[PDB]
Design a protein around this ligand. Structure first.
Ligand SMILES: CCCCCCCCCCCCCCCCCC(=O)OC[C@H](CO[C@@H]1O[C@H](CO[C@H]2O[C@H](CO)[C@H](O)[C@H](O)[C@H]2O)[C@H](O)[C@H](O)[C@H]1O)OC(=O)CCCCCCCCCCCCCCCCC
Ligand code: CLA
Ligand code: CLA
Ligand code: CLA
Ligand SMILES: CCCCCCCCCCCCCCCCCC(=O)OC[C@H](CO[C@@H]1O[C@H](CO)[C@H](O)[C@H](O)[C@H]1O)OC(=O)CCCCCCCCCCCCCCCCC
Ligand SMILES: CCCCCCCCCCCCCCCCCC(=O)OC[C@H](CO[C@@H]1O[C@H](CO)[C@H](O)[C@H](O)[C@H]1O)OC(=O)CCCCCCCCCCCCCCCCC
Ligand SMILES: CCCCCCCCCCCCCCCC(=O)OC[C@H](COP(=O)(O)OC[C@@H](O)CO)OC(=O)CCCCCCCCCCCCCCC
Ligand SMILES: CC1=C(/C=C/C(C)=C/C=C/C(C)=C/C=C/C=C(C)/C=C/C=C(C)/C=C/C2=C(C)CCCC2(C)C)C(C)(C)CCC1
Ligand SMILES: CC1=C(/C=C/C(C)=C/C=C/C(C)=C/C=C/C=C(C)/C=C/C=C(C)/C=C/C2=C(C)CCCC2(C)C)C(C)(C)CCC1
Ligand SMILES: CCCCCCCCCCCCO[C@@H]1O[C@H](CO)[C@@H](O[C@H]2O[C@H](CO)[C@@H](O)[C@H](O)[C@H]2O)[C@H](O)[C@H]1O
Ligand SMILES: CCCCCCCCCCCCO[C@@H]1O[C@H](CO)[C@@H](O[C@H]2O[C@H](CO)[C@@H](O)[C@H](O)[C@H]2O)[C@H](O)[C@H]1O
Ligand SMILES: CCCCCCCS[C@@H]1O[C@H](CO)[C@@H](O)[C@H](O)[C@H]1O
Ligand SMILES: CCCCCCCS[C@@H]1O[C@H](CO)[C@@H](O)[C@H](O)[C@H]1O
Ligand SMILES: CCCCCCCS[C@@H]1O[C@H](CO)[C@@H](O)[C@H](O)[C@H]1O
Ligand SMILES: [Ca+2]
Ligand SMILES: [Fe+2]
Ligand SMILES: [Mg+2]
Lengths: 341, 57, 30, 80, 34, 37, 33, 505, 63, 38, 34, 36, 34, 36, 30
């Protein structure tokens, strides 16, 4: 066999950490994305892009460090180190937000490499590649939130910054500006995530509480053998319990486990669709019938109208410091406030 | 009147809500943590104005 | 009209619960 | 079961700790000095506590020009 | 910059002591494959 | 016309019916508010 | 409430079209030998 | 039986009925195009390309007919506002009719191919089994695609035998269909150079012709045939879906940022033109040139075209809409009637004050007025008890130059405040809100709706690519893994190379 | 199966199912064209992005 | 002519080719030395 | 007779070596005063 | 080979982690990031 | 034309409900054993 | 126990065509009066 | 919307004519 097949042999050796052809893409990009995040959150400022401190070196903690997006004036520049903005200057590149695109782009190709890894390993051990298919949901979320959304907006500045508190700000921005909780695609996401967590808990608990006694120990974990032919728990008893408790129960184990893939994966895909809309400010912001009634009838109030007042406060009170390129000056008298507060 | 300030919030479908905006509204701030069963109200009309259904549910 | 529509869909779901529970395909051990 | 030496074997051997009693503290001290010499500030362009603002300036040095942002930061830094 | 030699010399002195105590076994592994 | 050998019967069992109707009805309960707007 | 006049027909067909699709498939499954 | 999500797999081994299904799908798409054009013609108002162009009216396929040279109606109007034009057959109506007739012919061919599915052509002469030689089919289709691509660029876009394409000035004031010469230098790769579109189709077409001939005449290498499963039609579905989502992301991007193929007179302005005050800068440039030439303020502003002023208005920004705010932009702010003219605000001292414009991000926005240096000088307060900058305290007036209100001045504070509220949207227009019962809430344009649908479809088709690519490469295990799966293949240490029985230790 | 006049004319075009060239065939040439195409897409992307800025190429409505 | 960003483009293109070239040369070299036994 | 320098060895040190360096840096930072 | 018992390595390594994380919490109250 | 707003849903349901009734009965007739 | 009174139901193709014609023509007739 | 409704029903009728003629249950002598 030729050099390609010799290379294929070495790439697919059974070792502690499997490499594979996909590893050529995955390992550099994953390592650089992670290394970029640790480097930036440890040493790198956001003073010139956001007017923020964002690193351990400046005094931030694990919750407040971030690798922040570039300034809005960078637009959607790839911000390559050798590009026209940094012109090869590593220090300037960091000050300009170059680590943000570095992490986002290497992270994107790393995620491609990881899903290729799932295909490659499944093919080598001889299993169907449903794990790779389930991973399309993380990828749809990453691509829609970190790439499509800022690409629809004015610049990378409005992408999420890579940090704990930075992400929290992203949540609150989406409430105040997009009314994102009102969006039926986000609601489907919530259902998929919370339903996924429910299925996770309920399935694990059911298996663990319909186990057969397959050993003498009061700690029951040792009474299982991976190569055994027999089910380790009673599907029949599990089915009767839930039929009598809840009204319906699983009876087909293949359907049950497919459903566990389907629910969270579909939920994440739906949330991605909503975010693609928010890229264009195509929000579910209002109910027109509500606004017409409320505008004409000052005694009409719902929780929907209450939440918009919260949104209006969020926008007015957060925009001047959250969007410094806009140079907003809102004199005290224009700020929306209720009584006393 | 969720916040006890005589500013009643509409929760029900027949009173201008849809599935997304509708709610059973919490009982009045004037009640606080007081137990407010139906038989504490002078009338069902009072009971409804003050958010009685929320406590029962 | 909207209220009727919302309550109609809800009522169909409750009816569906009844049939899905009491008129389910019975689990059979084969 | 893939042929590499087991980790528990390695990290309980004297030779491992002869090596890493040198290498681990050496790396730690190098990282310390990277900060304590101030070198980390200049590699990454991070402001020291006395370098966020000039003494009387009240305006953050936000970058506002894509293609001359490099010179803009340079000017912002010379004003300190 | 002196600060690079002051920061890299700890890391450089560590890579020298680790090849020194692994040389009897690094060349041994090398001669086996080839 | 000779019979096409690629034809196959199609099935939808009762559980799939109940699951499908639930999906459809719950989707309608969710999206109807936005259709009325 | 001044709702969209097409909301009713939109909701009605959204329910009915896929629902009848499923009922058609279910019933012809039951009637198979 | 087959579950509901697999019913169409009966076509996998039936080339003739697969062609029938593809014909039926093509019939439905062409039928949609024809019906969509007829519906738009039944609702389009052609009487004002200045303030009521197609993109204000929710027109989706009309700009695509106009982009390639169909600009007239049999009823005598053209979309550039001409009267008494003769388009020949290829009016909007003729295009619609042609698509309806095509739909019908395709429907009939689908019936034939469904009934007469068992054609000798679809059988492998050796085995008698159904067989499509997909590698050679690719070459044939690529050759044809290349010829058509080349012909579109060399004859249609050039006007050499065809009408050309829509082109316009940088501010979308004088667009029309023109012949366009190819651009063969580096500016051909500028998305805003239409000559690059012409050069693309000539050059790519020739490349497609050559590659097509290659793929007709050279068989795939055995290594590639096996690895991509070229005997399996689902491999073609996988990579075709991949190509299609790439193309869909591209057209979403060029719609949102603008290019020579997404002109603003057909799809509306972009959001970035509002972000960068693109039209405001050109308006200001023209006014200053007029003043420099001796014009009065009224004359200078009266010289601004209403069409240019209308682009400088946030109600035409495609990033101001809502997912469930349906219909034409006219359904929101109304049918624009006339420019009111440029509002100039002044305080009692007589300083000119400027209203801070609303960014696209904000559903609502305060009214704040600054002097030329950005110093706040007046606003509309929320809390009143500590107001310092109210229009009443600062004696704010507004005078209009150009448009309907030219030469008028308003001093009544509520009136001045109402104009200031409109000025956060940019230039101020009078709208007919009655004809459509408009609700006063901004909606997006065809540019926005096109971008949304195609980005969403592109992302969904990524899943399709993943799914059918998986089905192709894992066909042997579609029904499950081998019942006698060797435990040594999945446990560590038995084989040196994963999944290779010949490397057993 | 059914022979038709058009089917007989087209028969040779659907006759080489499964035919391959030996081994790697033109794979190396294919890889070169793929590499050039990658560079091409990178060029047009960076022009659109204002990462690659060329004389006489003003990426704006103003050209 | 050749603008600074075109020069930058060539620098990036060459840098990526070097990284990929060195990567594959190293992997190929290693794969040739440490072959699987069959 | 186990090998010493393996893929696993490299993977371990690409993570472990910077981690210790970074932890020394962050430790030093705890004594910076404004 | 096995001269240093695994339980001592785990105990010492664990104590090292506690020390370094303890230092990080100390730094939350002193110098940069302390609000003072 | 100011037509009755319920005319559309009335006509749609008038067509669809009985048509769907017949389609159900036809298809489950075809699928019975032959 | 199974109910012995059950019977299968049938609608042949001609009846389907006849019924659809009846429904569609009735709808074509009555729709004008529904819109009014 | 009324015109669309009228033309839709008409079009469905013409489609039914097509299926009733060319996709009829074939008359068979037994
Ligand atoms: C599932 C997939 C799984 C795997 C994913 C793997 C990830 C691979 C990594 C890909 C990264 C793509 C980066 C795209 C950068 C970009 O776009 O950069 C944007 C540039 C456009 O530049 C922008 O252009 C704007 C408009 O300017 C124009 O208008 C202005 C105002 O008038 C001026 O006139 C100006 O001169 C004129 O150029 C502004 O100037 C912005 O500041 C500027 O950033 O387009 C461009 O480079 C190219 C645009 C055309 C091609 C776009 C295709 C890819 C993107 C698809 C998504 C679209 C989303 C739309 C929203 C939904
Ligand atoms: C496979 C692993 C991998 C992948 C997919 C990427 C991908 C990327 N890198 Mg990363 N990187 C890697 C490994 C990788 N990198 C490694 C190992 C290092 C350490 C050296 C880095 C260090 C690094 C830095 C410092 C930066 C990147 C950047 C980038 C981005 C731009 C790259 C580019 O434009 O190259 C262009 C080059 C090619 C696409 C190669 C083309 C090869 C073709 C097919 C052959 C043609 C050869 C050609 C003819 C040679 C002629 C030259 C001559 C004409 C002058 C892109 C996301 C940039 C970034 O993220 O900006 C935010 C950036 O600044 N990378
Ligand atoms: C590429 C597709 C596309 C695009 C971009 C447009 C764009 C446009 N259309 Mg056209 N149209 C299309 C296809 C399209 N159309 C098709 C296929 C038809 C036949 C139905 C029409 C028939 C049509 C009519 C009759 C009209 C338009 C009009 C318009 C304009 C307003 C659009 C609007 O308000 O949308 C509103 C969009 C939404 C409310 C989004 C809906 C999102 C769906 C409901 C979500 C579904 C989620 C799903 C249930 C979840 C599944 C979950 C599961 C997987 C678990 C706009 C220019 C209007 C116009 O102004 O004409 C002049 C108008 O009157 N269109
Ligand atoms: C060119 C595009 C294309 C084509 C020709 C196919 C073809 C096929 N698909 Mg794939 N697929 C695609 C894209 C495509 N797909 C995309 C974009 C996705 C992500 C959404 C998928 C995800 C997918 C899955 C998960 C599966 C398939 C399966 C199949 C096979 C059975 C399909 C079937 O019987 O459905 C029958 C469908 C119905 C009876 C009703 C579907 C109702 C839809 C969901 C709602 C309304 C759709 C509406 C009319 C669409 C308008 C067009 C739209 C583009 C605007 C068939 C080979 C199946 C398979 O592999 O079987 C072995 C299967 O499980 N596809
Ligand atoms: C068999 C046929 C099946 C029929 C199903 C019936 C439809 C049910 C669902 C309808 C959904 C849309 C209802 C909108 C409410 C409404 O009344 O619209 C009404 C609008 C028309 O808008 C009307 O226009 C009028 C003047 O022409 C007036 O302005 C009216 O006020 C206005 O309502 O309908 C449309 O525009 C439909 C076309 C939508 C095209 C954009 C779609 C792009 C999004 C695709 C995303 C895919 C996501 C997949 C996720 C998985
Ligand atoms: C082998 C390792 C491979 C690499 C992957 C390791 C990833 C770990 C990322 C967390 C680093 C946290 C850190 O260094 O905090 C470093 C900070 C440094 O502490 C900060 O130092 C500053 C110095 O100027 C200031 O003094 C701040 O006041 C002070 O908080 O420590 C803390 O915040 C204390 C808690 C940290 C623990 C967080 C664990 C969270 C785990 C979540 C899951 C992931
Ligand atoms: C954790 C305990 C509670 C977990 C939630 C219960 C969920 C539903 C019941 C799920 C269920 O049925 O459990 C079953 C599972 C096995 O049951 P056994 O009967 O074998 O053992 C429990 C007793 O009988 C003692 O032998 O219980 C445990 O493993 C207990 C572990 C105690 C561990 C020490 C105390 C807790 C320390 C915290 C551990 C954190 C989690 C580690 C993994 C992430
Ligand atoms: C960016 C960049 C780059 C790269 C770099 C890198 C690659 C780096 C890496 C780095 C790293 C690699 C680092 C690391 C670090 C680490 C750390 C810093 C850690 C810490 C940890 C901790 C602190 C822990 C904690 C905890 C947890 C988590 C849990 C429990 C326990 C405890 C609490 C302890 C390059 C040059 C290419 C180019 C330019 C750019
Ligand atoms: C037969 C014939 C004929 C006739 C024809 C015709 C008359 C046709 C028509 C056709 C048509 C008239 C067609 C239409 C179509 C349509 C379509 C196909 C549509 C679809 C739609 C869709 C698919 C949608 C979807 C949706 C919705 C609903 C909601 C929103 C979202 C979406 C967009 C997804 C003639 C005389 C020529 C002669 C020959 C024969
Ligand atoms: C307005 C919305 C309406 C949308 C829904 C409309 C489309 C519904 C199409 C359903 C098509 C069912 O297709 C139907 O398949 C069944 C098997 O499943 C076939 O049945 C065939 O197979 C079974 C095998 O068990 C045999 O008993 C039977 O004798 C044979 O004819 C029918 O001949 C066919 O008519
Ligand atoms: C909004 C529109 C809603 C309209 C709803 C329409 C309701 C239609 C209900 C139709 C019910 C048909 O009822 C169906 O009858 C068939 C026979 O015909 C039964 O079928 C039974 O008989 C046949 C033939 O002897 C056997 O092949 C089959 O095994 C047996 O179960 C099905 O078990 C039953 O499901
Ligand atoms: C990494 C891209 C894969 C491209 C594969 C092209 C291999 S090229 C191929 O290589 C064989 C050895 O591998 C030799 O037998 C043969 O001489 C040569 O034609
Ligand atoms: C199916 C109906 C066909 C009707 C054909 C009417 C032909 S009309 C004819 O068509 C040409 C189109 O380019 C014009 O150039 C020409 O001036 C015009 O008179
Ligand atoms: C009462 C102050 C003078 C009149 C209003 C000044 C703003 S202008 C006013 O704005 C309306 C939307 O609110 C448009 O519908 C209308 O066409 C336009 O005249
Ligand atoms: Ca009105
Ligand atoms: Fe399980
Ligand atoms: Mg500190």
């Amino acid at each position: 066999r030729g050099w390609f097949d010799i290379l294929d042999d070495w790439l697919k050796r059974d070792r502690f950490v499997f490499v594979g052809w996909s590893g050529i893409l995955l390992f550099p990009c994953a390592y650089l994305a992670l290394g970029g995040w640790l480097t930036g959150t440890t040493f790198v400022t956001s003073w010139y892009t956001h007017g923020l401190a964002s690193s351990y070196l400046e005094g931030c903690n694990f919750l407040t460090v971030a690798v922040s997006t570039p300034a809005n004036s960078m637009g959607h520049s790839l911000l390559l180190l050798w590009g026209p903005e940094a012109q090869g200057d590593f220090t300037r590149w960091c000050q300009l937000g170059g680590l943000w695109t570095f992490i986002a782009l290497h992270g994107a190709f790393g995620l491609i490499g990881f899903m290729l890894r799932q295909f490659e390993i499944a093919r080598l051990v001889g299993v169907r590649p449903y794990n790779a298919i389930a991973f399309s949901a993380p990828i749809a979320v990453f691509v829609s939130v970190f790439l499509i959304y800022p690409l629809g907006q004015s610049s990378w500045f409005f992408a999420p910054s890579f940090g704990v508190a930075a992400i929290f700000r992203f949540l609150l921005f989406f409430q105040g500006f997009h009314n994102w909780t009102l969006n039926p695609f986000h609601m489907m996401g919530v259902a998929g995530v919370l339903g996924g967590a429910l299925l996770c808990a309920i399935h694990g608990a059911t298996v663990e509480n319909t186990l057969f006694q397959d050993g003498e120990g009061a700690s029951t974990f040792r009474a299982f053998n991976p190569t055994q032919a027999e089910e380790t728990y009673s599907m029949v008893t599990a089915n009767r319990f839930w039929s009598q408790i809840f009204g319906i129960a699983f009876s087909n184990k293949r359907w049950l486990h497919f459903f566990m893939l389907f629910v969270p994966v579909t939920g994440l895909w739906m949330s991605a669709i909503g975010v693609v809309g928010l890229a264009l400010n195509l929000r579910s912001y209002d109910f027109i019938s509500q606004e017409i009634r409320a505008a004409e009838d000052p005694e009409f109030e719902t929780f929907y109208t209450k939440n918009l007042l919260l949104n209006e406060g969020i926008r007015a009170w957060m925009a001047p410091q959250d969007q410094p390129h806009e140079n907003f000056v809102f004199p005290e008298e224009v700020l929306p406030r209720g009584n006393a507060l | 009147d969720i916040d006890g300030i005589r500013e009643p919030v509409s929760g029900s479908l027949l009173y201008g809500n849809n599935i997304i905006t509708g709610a059973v509204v919490p009982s009045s701030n004037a009640i606080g943590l007081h137990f407010y069963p139906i038989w504490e109200a002078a009338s069902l009309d009072e009971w409804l104005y003050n958010g009685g259904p929320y406590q029962l549910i | 009209m909207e209220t009727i529509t919302y309550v109609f869909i809800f009522a169909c779901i409750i009816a569906l619960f009844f049939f899905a529970i009491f008129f389910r395909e019975p689990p059979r051990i084969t | 079961t893939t042929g590499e030496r087991p980790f528990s074997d390695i990290i309980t051997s004297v030779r491992y700790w002869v090596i890493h009693s040198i290498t681990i503290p050496a790396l730690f001290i190098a990282g310390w000095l990277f900060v304590s010499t101030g070198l980390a500030y200049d590699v990454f362009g991070t402001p020291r506590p006395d370098s966020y603002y000039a003494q009387e300036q009240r305006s953050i040095p936000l970058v506002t020009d894509r293609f001359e942002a490099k010179q803009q930061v340079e000017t912002f830094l010379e004003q300190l | 910059d002196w600060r690079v030699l002051v920061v890299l010399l700890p890391v450089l002195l560590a890579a020298g002591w680790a090849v020194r105590n692994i040389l009897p076994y690094a060349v041994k592994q090398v001669q086996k494959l080839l | 016309m000779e019979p096409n050998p690629n034809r196959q019967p199609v099935e939808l069992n009762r559980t799939s019916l109940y699951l499908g109707l639930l999906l459809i009805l719950v989707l309608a309960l969710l999206f109807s508010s936005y259709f009325f707007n | 409430m001044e709702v969209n006049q097409l909301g009713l027909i939109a909701t009605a067909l959204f329910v009915l079209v896929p629902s009848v699709f499923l009922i058609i498939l279910y019933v012809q499954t039951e009637s198979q030998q | 039986g087959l579950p509901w999500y697999r019913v169409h797999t009966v076509l996998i081994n039936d080339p003739g009925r697969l062609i029938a299904a593809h014909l039926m799908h093509t019939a439905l798409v062409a039928g949609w195009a024809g019906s969509m054009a007829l519906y738009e013609l039944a609702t389009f108002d052609p009487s004002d390309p200045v303030l009521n162009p197609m993109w204000r009216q929710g027109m989706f396929v009309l700009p695509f007919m106009a982009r390639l040279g169909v600009t007239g109606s049999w009823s005598g109007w053209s979309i550039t506002g001409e009267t008494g034009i003769d388009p020949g057959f290829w009016s909007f109506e003729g295009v619609a009719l042609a698509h309806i007739v095509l739909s019908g012919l395709l429907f009939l061919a689908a019936c034939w191919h469904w009934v007469y599915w068992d054609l000798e052509l679809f059988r492998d002469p050796r085995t008698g089994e159904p067989a499509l030689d997909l590698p050679k089919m690719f070459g044939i289709h690529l050759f044809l695609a290349g010829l058509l691509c080349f012909g579109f660029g060399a004859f249609h876009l050039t006007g050499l035998f065809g009408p050309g394409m829509w082109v316009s000035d940088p501010y979308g004031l004088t667009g029309s269909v023109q012949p366009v010469a190819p651009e063969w230098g580096p500016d051909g790769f500028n998305p805003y150079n239409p000559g690059g579109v012409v050069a693309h189709h000539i050059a790519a077409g020739i490349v497609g012709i050559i590659a097509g001939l290659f793929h007709i005449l050279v068989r795939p290498p055995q290594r590639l045939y096996k690895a991509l499963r070229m005997g399996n039609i689902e491999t073609v579905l996988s990579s075709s879906i991949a190509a299609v989502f790439f193309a869909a992301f591209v057209v979403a991007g060029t719609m949102w940022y603008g290019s020579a193929t997404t002109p603003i007179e057909l799809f509306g302005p972009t959001r970035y033109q509002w972000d960068s005050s693109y039209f405001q800068q050109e308006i200001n440039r023209r006014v200053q040139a007029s003043l420099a030439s001796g014009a009065t303020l009224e004359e200078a502003w009266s010289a601004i075209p209403e069409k240019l002023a209308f682009y400088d208005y946030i109600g035409n920004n495609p990033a101001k809409g809502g997912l469930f705010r349906t219909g034409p932009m006219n359904k929101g702010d109304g049918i624009a009637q006339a420019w009111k003219g440029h509002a100039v605000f002044r305080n009692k001292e007589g300083e000119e004050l400027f209203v801070r414009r609303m960014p696209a991000f904000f559903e609502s926005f305060p009214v704040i007025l600054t002097d030329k240096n950005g110093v706040v000088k007046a606003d509309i307060p929320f809390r009143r008890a500590e107001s310092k900058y109210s229009f009443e305290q600062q004696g704010v007036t507004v005078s209009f130059y150009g448009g309907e209100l030219n030469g008028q001045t308003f001093t009544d504070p509520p009136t001045v405040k109402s104009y200031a509220r409109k000025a956060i949207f940019g230039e101020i227009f009078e709208f007919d809100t009655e004809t459509l019962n408009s609700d006063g809430i901004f909606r997006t344009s065809p540019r926005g709706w096109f971008t949304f649908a195609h980005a969403v479809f592109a992302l969904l088709f990524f899943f399709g690519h993943i799914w059918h690519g998986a089905r192709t490469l894992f066909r042997d295990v579609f029904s499950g893994i081998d019942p006698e799966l060797s435990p040594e293949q999945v446990e560590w240490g038995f084989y040196q190379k994963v999944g290779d029985v010949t490397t057993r230790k | 199966a059914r022979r038709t006049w058009l089917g007989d004319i087209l028969r040779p075009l659907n006759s080489e199912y499964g035919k391959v060239a030996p081994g790697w065939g033109t794979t190396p040439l294919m890889a070169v064209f793929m590499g050039l195409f990658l560079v091409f897409l990178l060029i047009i992307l960076e022009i659109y992005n204002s990462t690659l800025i060329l004389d006489g190429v003003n990426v704006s409505w103003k050209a | 002519t050749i603008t600074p960003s075109l020069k930058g483009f060539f620098i990036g293109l060459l840098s990526g080719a070097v990284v990929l070239g060195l990567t594959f040369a190293v992997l190929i070299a290693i794969s040739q030395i440490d072959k699987v036994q069959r | 007779s186990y090998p010493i320098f393996t893929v696993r060895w490299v993977a371990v040190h690409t993570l472990a070596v910077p981690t210790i360096f970074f932890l020394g840096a962050i430790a030093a930072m705890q004594f910076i005063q404004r | 080979g096995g001269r240093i018992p695994l339980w001592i390595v785990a105990t010492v390594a664990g104590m090292g982690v506690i020390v370094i994380v303890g230092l990080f919490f100390y730094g939350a109250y002193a110098g940069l990031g302390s609000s003072l």
